[PDB]
Curated annotation (Swiss-Prot), chain B:
Residues 190-240 are annotated as: Heptad repeat 1. This is Spike protein S2. It comes from Severe acute respiratory syndrome coronavirus 2 (2019-nCoV). The record marks 106-107 as: Cleavage. Disulfide bonds join 29-51, 34-40, 302-313, 352-396. Precursor of the fusion protein processed in the biosynthesis of the S protein and the formation of virus particle. Mediates fusion of the virion and cellular membranes by functioning as a class I viral fusion protein. Contains two viral fusion peptides that are unmasked after cleavage. The S2/S2' cleavage occurs during virus entry at the cell membrane by host TMPRSS2 or during endocytosis by host CSTL. The chain holds residues 710 to 1153 of 1273 of the full protein.
């Protein structure tokens, strides 16, 4: 679940105070709360490895379901493989 | 019988600025109209699925804006890098290549473009929110950098498949052949061409820096979306015939039977305002999509290749183009060959020699008033008219305006310088 | 209704300039300074452009000029005699008049 | 092994017609809706900046 | 409705300008872009609203 | 890739071996001068 336009601190505080209008709660355990520019993403583990974009999140961040059992992960998308061309005179 | 032929040329760089994407907005229909009032929400439900349609229209626009950005910039399979030593025949590309010393790794020109055009905005945050682009400014800059590295190090082979390295001056020589100018024109004047290129790029940087309106198209896109949202928010203060523009005051003062009437008046006005906003956004989205499609076409035909479409890739004969990123859009620098310093020569459609009509294979016959020469059409370079440069078809009679001149045959001349006397 | 910024005479002047440029300087006009070229040689270049050699034009120059003149006369007669030839523009006018 | 090759040619002129501009209109919103009535204009102001 | 028609006319005008540049100010190799047949040249003529 | 022998039929000549940057030394073959040799160089 992505809470758009909010800080993760504000969401976590609202969860602890039982202030959020939707009454369902995502487990929101350690390593599943990640701050993006789009908003606070809860329920996906952010990894450093880049992958091709699958489900867009925003601001460079995409999420996908991947085996690492399986889970939903978030990552900065890869733009492509690197190719250094052997330019010479 | 008069033809003008250029004797010099200018390398010119022009700038074309195109919008690619809009600010992506999202509207919470119920809060905008009813603002957290339960009574209003219950009345709003009687108008059917208008909020649902409005949400899909804005979602579709947001998706299209990301599609437009990807279609314009993500045209390269791989991210190409320039060599550690940025020497390209004397062509200085530092103004259009990433500057490693600055954050974001943008070129000097991209940084200028980003500074001239102007993530929680407190203003207008009354249910109207803005979604970030899917690609960040750094990712767009990376695509632009890859496109520039590909073009600079591998020319036109990059767009059609694997990137094949070629020395830059030879890429330019090919491009010169592409515009009907021989390779030796570039190689004899390579220093002049590189100096004119560098001057033109410096002029681009100064032109963009000093002209407040250079990027008006992108500022206009930003201004239209900001104005559309200011109008949509401003409409909340209107009464539309209601006793008050504030929903909480209507509920605070009146009993349900009267509040429903005043609320329905506010719902009608606010819902009509949202439909007006969405319709205008759909029209603007269509205009931006058309612009993005043009920008993607230009990216493919001007940057990933050499175009022969007149005025498509700037004024003059197209040589090459370089993309630069800009907020909500793309700026293309189009490098063209412009003829200069023409001279007026006498011409003829054919030369008559031994009773046969000789026509140019690749060129035009010219005269300086005493001697006939064959020259290429786009650059004065007189050659001796010979049986290798011309072809023969017909007699010296049908062609109108044929003139008498000697056509030299090397082999008959050679046969003389070998055994004419036998001993 | 607001008048157009360019008058019909100004548009005609732009069209005239475009025609004079094309007729007297060919394709050199669009890319930079206008360079005069004899018209039959402009056509010979254009013939090379379509994969036909220059001598085809020069051997048949009179035939080509006559066919051109005939085709233009046919254009004038076609437009004069066909009531629907310009329907796209009449449709634009009719849609705006109907809207008002 | 059969190829057809033109032995003659025709110079053809065709006509393409494209719209470029519309009649440019302007609407005085208040007169259209209220036609010089002050009472209507004062009621029209309650609908905001339409 | 006027905004929609304006968008359609703009698209037409953009096509007309493209054709002006590629058919009148040059020789096009785009099939059927500048009429049927192999393109040699084009001549513009003015018309009301187009 | 289709290597051909560099000859006076495949190339054109313009200028001296000085202005062009990066010019390299190689033989350019001329069939007619070679042919003239295989016809009457010795006369008899
Ligand atoms: C390729 O061009 C760039 C410029 O486009 C050359 O880099 C340096 O450019 C600056 C101007 O931006 C040159 O002038 C400097 O201006 C600053 C202004 O504050 C001044 O403080 C400096 O003292 C200087 O005058 C600078 O001279 C120039 N660098 C050099 C070494 O000349 C770049 O060098 C060019 N590259 C090649 C390979 O020629
Ligand atoms: C073709 O046109 C180019 C310019 O578009 C000509 O190159 C320019 O030639 C002039 C000399 O006539 C150069 O001016 C001189 O520059 C030196 C620089 O130190 C200065 O000391 C002299 O007093 C004078 O101003 C000019 O720099 C040069 N421009 C470039 C970009 O290289 C070229 O000569 C023309 N060629 C023909 C065949 O007409
Ligand atoms: C290629 O086609 C063109 C026409 O597209 C041929 O030119 C035409 O040739 C005919 C003769 O076969 C000409 O007709 C004659 O015209 C005179 C005019 O005074 C008339 O008195 C005769 O009774 C007869 O009708 C026709 O005018 C001429 N058309 C043009 C436009 O010049 C050409 O001969 C053909 N060439 C080949 C190689 O087949
Ligand atoms: C036309 O061009 C020819 C060739 O360059 C000129 O004749 C040559 O002129 C040079 C001096 O500039 C002499 O050294 C050559 O011997 C001349 N060649 C021949 C074949 O006579 C000619 O003078 C030019 N004429 C005009 C009017 O510009
Ligand atoms: C080119 O040279 C030919 C001769 O080689 C000229 O042809 C002669 O022209 C005169 C009239 O000018 C006639 O009386 C002769 O009978 C023609 N002779 C031949 C063999 O055809 C021709 O006129 C010259 N053309 C130009 C343009 O000067
Ligand atoms: C190509 O060959 C020429 C000779 O035919 C070389 O020119 C000589 O170069 C040396 C220095 O390398 C000079 O001292 C001589 O005076 C030059 N002679 C002539 C006749 O020009 C040339 O350097 C060779 N080029 C390459 C790239 O090897
Ligand atoms: C969220 O709040 C913390 C409070 O310390 C702040 O440091 C952080 O920058 C904020 N993040 C965003 C994305 O606003």
């Amino acid at each position: 679940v992505l809470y758009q336009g909010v800080n993760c601190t504000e969401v976590s505080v609202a969860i602890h105070a039982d202030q959020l209008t939707p009454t369902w709660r995502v487990y929101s355990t350690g390593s599943n709360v990640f701050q993006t520019r789009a908003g606070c993403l809860i329920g996906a583990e952010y990894v450093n490895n880049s992958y091709e974009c699958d489900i867009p999140i925003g601001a460079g961040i995409c999420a996908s379901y991947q085996t690492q059992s399986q889970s939903i992960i978030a990552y900065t998308m890869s733009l492509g493989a690197e190719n250094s061309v052997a330019y010479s005179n | 019988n008069s033809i003008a032929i250029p004797t010099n040329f200018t390398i010119s760089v022009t700038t074309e600025i195109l919008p690619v994407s809009m600010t992506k907005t999202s509207v919470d229909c119920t809060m905008y109209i009813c603002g957290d009032s339960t009574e209003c929400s219950n009345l709003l439900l009687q108008y059917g699925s208008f909020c649902t349609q409005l949400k899909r229209a804005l979602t579709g626009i947001a998706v299209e804006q990301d599609k437009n950005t990807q279609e314009v910039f993500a045209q390269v399979k791989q991210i190409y890098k320039t060599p550690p030593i940025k020497y390209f025949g004397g062509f200085n590309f530092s103004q259009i290549l990433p500057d490693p010393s600055k954050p974001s790794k943008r070129s000097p020109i991209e940084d200028l473009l980003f500074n001239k055009v102007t993530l929680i905005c407190a203003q207008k945050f009354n249910g109207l929110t803005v979604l970030p682009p899917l690609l960040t400014d750094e990712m767009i800059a990376q695509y632009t950098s890859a496109l520039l590295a590909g073009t600079i190090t591998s020319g036109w082979t990059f767009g059609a498949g694997p990137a094949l390295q070629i020395p830059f001056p030879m890429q330019m020589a090919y491009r010169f052949n592409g515009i009907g100018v021989t390779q030796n024109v570039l190689y004899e004047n390579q220093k002049l061409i590189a100096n004119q290129f560098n001057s033109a790029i410096g002029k681009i940087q100064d032109s963009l820096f000093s002209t407040p309106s250079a990027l008006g198209k992108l500022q206009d896109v930003v201004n239209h979306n900001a104005q559309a949202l200011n109008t949509l928010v401003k409409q909340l203060s209107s009464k539309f015939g209601a006793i008050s523009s504030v929903l909480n005051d209507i509920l605070s003062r009146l009993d349900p039977p009267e509040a429903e009437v005043q609320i329905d008046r506010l719902i009608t006005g606010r819902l009509q305002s949202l439909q007006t906003y969405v319709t205008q956004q759909l029209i603007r989205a269509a205009e931006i999509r058309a612009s993005a499609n043009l920008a993607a076409t230009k990216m493919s035909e001007c940057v990933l290749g050499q175009s022969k479409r007149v005025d498509f890739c700037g004024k003059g004969y197209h040589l090459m183009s370089f993309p630069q990123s800009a907020p909500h859009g793309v700026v293309f620098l189009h490098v063209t060959y412009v003829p200069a310093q023409e001279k007026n020569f006498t011409t003829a459609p054919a030369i008559c020699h031994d009773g046969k009509a000789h026509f140019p294979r690749e060129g035009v016959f010219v005269s300086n008033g005493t001697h006939w020469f064959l020259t290429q059409r786009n650059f004065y370079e007189p050659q001796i008219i010979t049986t290798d440069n011309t072809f023969v078809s017909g007699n010296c009679d049908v062609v109108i305006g044929i003139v008498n001149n000697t056509v030299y045959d090397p082999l008959q001349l050679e046969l003389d310088s070998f055994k004419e006397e036998l001993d």
